[model samples]
Target: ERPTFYRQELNKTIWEVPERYQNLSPVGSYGSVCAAFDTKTGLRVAVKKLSRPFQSIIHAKRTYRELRLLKHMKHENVIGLLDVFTPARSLEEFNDVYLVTHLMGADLNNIVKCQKLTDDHVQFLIYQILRGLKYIHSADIIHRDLKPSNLAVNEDCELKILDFGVATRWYRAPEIMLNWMHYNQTVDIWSVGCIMAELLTGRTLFPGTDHIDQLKLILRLVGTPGAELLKKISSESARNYIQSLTQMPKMNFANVFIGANPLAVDLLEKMLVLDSDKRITAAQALAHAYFAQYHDPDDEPVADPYDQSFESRDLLIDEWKSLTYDEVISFVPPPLD
Candidate 1:
């Protein structure tokens, strides 16, 4: 299920210096995604070291989930897990967890703010997003977390989404706002649709600056769904909440998305649909006419569902650490860059 990996240690508590990692740029953090040059591989790598992951249930689960997802899902558009290690020598002392991934110029949102994204760049990047989503979805995994800040890219136009979660409600789907029983993969499609608008306009689609404002923007763009549709769902409270907003008209995508192609806007509407059941799937989204030029039936790939048995099953903090520790040591690192 994983490639070979060997554990490494640091003399400093907060990562000051190491022979293996030279030219430490002190890039930045997540808990901290700092940059360093690997002496062994002679390549730039971003090292994200999470502190005290076992401190809480949610924290531990997120740590395990990210590690498992990164290791299991391999695609060009998805970030690659080069190495995973810890500062502690043994499970008893393990506290900080370090994960290594390729270093990119910057994040997608940062890029949009600083520079312009050409139409070609938008198409290629969007295609990559859907293509990677197809692979993840094939494995029965939903990237419930899709945000520009976590999506990474380099000068060559190659794109990859960084650690999956941790984006804001800005990219969240409408159903996610109302919520559901085990939210479906379509939620990810809605996120992509929002990001698609961002790529086209070079600005966040739903720039919900505040809590109430976000709801306003969501309603502004999507407009209120019909009473008939709201009454259709089984949830009593959901039916009532869907009626919370005053009746609003759906904003036409073509009218709003200035300079964006007609066909691209057409595809955007399909992706941002209110009904998850009707929302275009990642695979279906990729097959849209807008992507006809880049779409390749031969190149598009799929995988059997990943083993998610451990997802709902609870595990103690110690056990989660052990699983992750064992997994880290099991990886031997990929052949040189």
Candidate 2:
């Protein structure tokens, strides 16, 4: 059974302001994640408006899965759904569907663009990312998108996994990459490998310059698979992934990052295992020698201070109190500085 949520006024929206959200301004946005200021409580909240129309099955499945998961699991490393609004009740008033969630820090890509992450910072990020994934996976949720931009870090550096729009990409434990037969949890393992490389090198593992280039990028890092494996899954697209890799000369992981730590490298290679059957899991990888070496008892850190700072939110409460439902609902933060 799913956990019960506390129904509050925040769960519903009573108005719309095209002017405020026109440029997708002052509020934050990134392909997805539609954020705005909530003047009511003087607090900044992110309303991740599902961009796809509800008629789309993939979008609905993803949104419903997230809501169900959040209803059941709450952790420092996972974004919390504050309220859920749908047209059933809203149609009588305004009309729409939206998931209101806690507004936290920027995703990995944006953060790295502004500030270089130290070895420690990278480790902290990898650790927290794993922590959240483990929790979600344990609850039977596969977060298919484990890329840098989906990993959110607040000001104090508490990391959480967000924008799980494509969980299959991260969690599909299928027998094959592009086919249904050959499936397994190896998808997420591959993504984590990509993320680990980016964190350590301060760049994307797959730096595909364009559409076709992105496929080329994925092929470069992961290398190619044998033909027999693709046939088992009866997937031509999966085979296409293999054939694409053969088109390019293999790139040595050694030469990619000059000062890459041996332990980190070892971890990356294991996660990038081309064979889904051989891929390491989050739990198993946690026990691997790579993690065992870099992780020190003294290195354990705390979550972002804001995670524990409700008092600071009170400062804006007074000014926002008199605002109407629309005004109260639009409070938001500026783009990452």
Candidate with maximal lDDT: 1
| Cα RMSD for candidates in order | 3.6, 11.6
* lDDT of candidate 1 over 1-337, digit per residue (tens): 3223334344333663345776655676426666888877887998887766778877787788778877775677888788777656677877778788889887788778776778878889999888888887888887787888878889887888666532388898876776667578888888889888887887788877765577678878778887656766778887776677677888888899866888899999899877667789988888888987899988879865678777877888778878878777787676663
Total clashing pairs for each candidate: 7, 20
Supply the global lDDT for candidate 2.
Answer: 0.54
lDDT of 2 by residue, 1-337 (tens): 2222222222332323322222121344312345556544445667654444233444434443454444444666777666554333222242234566667767777877665667767766777776666666665455666677677788888988875422223322223234455355557777777777766766656655544555555556555555555555565775565565555444567677667777677777777766677777776666566555444444333322222122233323222222112322342322232
Model 2: lDDT of residue 231: 58
Q: After superposition, how far is residue 312 of candidate 1 from its true place, in Å?
A: 1.0
Kindly report which residue pairs in candidate 1 clash with one another: 4-331, 4-332, 4-333, 5-331, 5-332, 29-32, 29-33
**Candidate 2 regions with alpha-carbon error over 4 angstroms:** 1-26, 29-43, 48-66, 85-94, 165-182, 209-212, 227-231, 236-252, 293-337
The CA lDDT of each predicted structure is: 0.77, 0.54
